[PDB]
């Protein structure tokens, strides 16, 4: 009983300090910048070959090779320049929700509803792609696999927890807990020592991979958070929920900086990504199109459109040369 | 394509495309169905020709040169709003109800879901003998206090069927009903008729006749 009141006064103190630190909104301080105008992107490539809905996609570190999983049980690796299928990996379970591409390009992990994170080896001496490891230990559907290195991978599940694995041993090295709902998405910081996870309890909290501690937590969303992406310099992140709103939280200030809501937007955000500079906040909605938000004034600086069904995944290359979108109509489109 | 290695890469890509097309052609013969219902309702014991293969459970029995894949979503124990859209393309929903309120709640939730507004439902009422033996011992009034009709088996079963169909509340959807016992073998035939009827209706809608 006393612990409940202690928690209540702790939350009150945290909120009071958080409001005390706030002096001016981002939209007020940066009001003097020239607008970026209208950013028109044209479809340069259209990657076809998938025969079912696409849930995930990841870009190679070299910004030329892709990876995508769909309901057909196929894991296809594309050549984003000449539109060629380098590999075609058949999954054991057709229910897959999260691709991941290794930073070194050697491995590609691909897990989903079947509760395990299958890890595939691309550079084999036999010339084929083999499942190097199959990581088990989660009691719920998997989401947003991310590679730290060639032998370290972070996973998120519907078990209201995130886990850090060791591919060599295959055991759950560290487990992060504290969420009260299904954890839907995570993104790894460029410094590669912290990561943030967006759960179904309308809250995203920052984690530490080394200590396994919840350093920070962020609130403000009215519904389940569906995607998260870090700011390029590793000091902010943008979240997307079914509330049809995007928000920009800052790790140093511990508060949301601005909101990216438009009156004409009804459906929520499925995927969130930034640009290389950190000025365009691209977000995918359920109304079949993506809106490019100028991340400093919250004005729609163009619309991608072009897709027939819901956009399920976004991807911005490391050099920023392209933006690739995947949707449920089994078509990937590359924009520039 | 000018180089030799790029020509070989293009040939490899074309071979992969051909393999993908063949696999997709071979992946259209099957029929994808969804199993649902309360626990201990016989949702895993419909057809004796089971041939299965924590997570998702697949059953791939075949009939009349047609492959039926039953995805039993049981055991997930998570929020259905986040993965139920993975089954948007299922031909039908097989709902199993044991007659011997929660089942009505699931049925209401699954029938009015935004993903399955046009997906027909095949409703199975299991354990006729158990229900008929239990109704004599206890009248159908403890769970349905609004009942007024006769306590006979036929009228009670029809009343339960009526309350299960009353939650439809949607056009472009049909509920196919069937009464099953433990010692029944023709469930495959009933599923085949329901699936072919659903396919006929979908083709009718696509052709523009209706």
């Amino acid at each position: 009983d006393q612990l409940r009141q202690e928690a209540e006064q702790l939350k009150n103190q945290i909120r009071d300090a958080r409001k005390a630190c706030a002096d001016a909104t981002l939209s007020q301080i940066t009001n003097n910048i020239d607008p970026v105008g209208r950013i028109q992107m044209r479809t340069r490539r259209t990657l076809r070959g998938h025969l079912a809905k696409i849930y995930a996609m990841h870009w190679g570190t070299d910004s030329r090779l892709l990876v995508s999983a769909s309901q057909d049980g196929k894991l296809i690796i594309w050549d984003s320049y000449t539109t060629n299928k380098v590999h075609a990996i058949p999954l054991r379970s057709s229910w897959v929700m999260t691709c991941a591409y290794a930073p070194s390009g050697n491995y590609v992990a691909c897990g989903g509803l079947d509760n395990i994170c299958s890890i595939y080896n691309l550079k084999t001496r036999e010339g084929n792609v083999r499942v190097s490891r199959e990581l088990a230990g989660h009691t719920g559907y998997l989401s947003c696999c991310r590679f730290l290195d060639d032998n370290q991978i972070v996973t998120s599940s519907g078990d209201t927890t995130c886990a850090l694995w060791d591919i060599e041993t295959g055991q759950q090295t560290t487990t992060f807990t504290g969420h009260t709902g299904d954890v839907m998405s995570l993104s790894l910081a460029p410094d590669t020592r912290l990561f943030v996870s967006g759960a179904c309890d309308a809250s995203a909290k920052l984690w530490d991979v080394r200590e396994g501690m919840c350093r920070q937590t962020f609130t403000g969303h009215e519904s389940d958070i569906n995607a998260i992406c870090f700011f390029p310099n590793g000091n902010a992140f943008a979240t997307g929920s079914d509330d049809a709103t995007c928000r920009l939280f800052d790790l140093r200030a511990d508060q949301e900086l601005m909101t990216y809501s438009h009156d004409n937007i009804i459906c929520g955000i499925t995927s969130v990504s930034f640009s290389k500079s950190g000025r365009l906040l691209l977000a995918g909605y359920d109304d079949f199109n993506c809106n490019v938000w100028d991340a400093l004034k919250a004005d729609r600086a163009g619309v991608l459109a072009g897709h027939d069904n819901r956009v399920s995944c976004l991807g911005v290359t490391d050099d920023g040369m392209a933006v690739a979108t995947g949707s449920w109509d089994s078509f990937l489109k590359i924009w520039n | 394509t000018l180089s030799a290695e790029e020509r070989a890469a293009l040939e490899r890509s074309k071979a992969i495309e051909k393999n993908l097309k063949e696999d997709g052609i071979s992946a259209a013969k099957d029929v994808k169905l969804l199993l649902l219902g309360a626990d201990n309702s016989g949702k895993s014991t419909i057809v004796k020709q089971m041939k299965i293969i924590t997570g998702i459970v697949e059953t791939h029995f075949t009939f009349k040169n047609l492959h039926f894949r039953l995805f039993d979503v049981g055991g997930q124990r998570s929020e259905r709003k986040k993965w139920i859209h993975c089954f948007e393309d299922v031909t039908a929903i097989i709902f199993c109800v044991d007659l011997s309120h929660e089942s009505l709640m699931l049925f209401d939730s699954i029938c009015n879901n935004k993903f399955f507004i046009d997906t027909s439902i095949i409703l199975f009422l299991n354990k006729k003998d158990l229900f008929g033996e239990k109704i004599k011992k206890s009248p159908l009034t403890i769970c349905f206090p609004e009942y007024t009709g006769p306590n006979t088996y036929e009228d009670a079963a029809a009343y339960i069927q009526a309350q299960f169909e009353s939650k439809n509340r949607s056009p472009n959807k049909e509920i196919y009903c069937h009464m099953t016992c433990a010692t029944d073998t023709n469930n495959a035939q009933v599923i085949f008729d329901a699936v072919t009827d659903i396919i006929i209706a979908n083709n009718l809608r696509g052709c523009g006749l209706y």
Partner: single-chain antibody
Amino acid sequence: DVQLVESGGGLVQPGGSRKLSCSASGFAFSSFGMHWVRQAPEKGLEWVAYISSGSGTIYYADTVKGRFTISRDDPKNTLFLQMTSLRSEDTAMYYCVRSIYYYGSSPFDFWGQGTTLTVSSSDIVMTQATSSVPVTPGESVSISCRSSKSLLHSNGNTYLYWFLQRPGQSPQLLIYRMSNLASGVPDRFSGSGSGTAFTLTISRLEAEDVGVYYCMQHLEYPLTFGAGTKLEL
């Protein structure tokens, strides 16, 4: 273990027909384009034939065009080579080489053990400046070979391959485009080049590194090898 072993060699009379079988075991045979490379006695390597994956595209050398026949048996994991008429110039040690082509692959990594065949009695020209170089261990060595055309394609990839043949063994790939190190070779190797002049350097040479170094172009068929530079100790 990847292993290519071939049989069918021996002494044959001129005008006869002989078939060589290259049996593969240890990799996905159906996904690898396979070549045939012959090495005349103390003369050097020379390309012969190539069959793509699935027997789609097949090429032949101008010397034996219309005279040899190459066939692929994917279920049996066997590669054949049928020759109709044999002259006295066909006597050589025939090698079987696998080649997989995609973005970032190593298309000459593994070579067969070699089979010896004896017979009783426009193109891109690659030239190697020196035929024999004596050197002591621990001293860096520079090997260079030129090409007639500029192998630097429009896509930025230069198709130059450097092979190493230890005495009594089969050639092994070291660098496949300009500096892309092969799988398992020591990191002391390094390669460079610009358009038509290319150089291979070996820092801290070891005693197991002596042999004959071949540079081959893959820009356009027929593939042509260099004269061959031999390291002496």
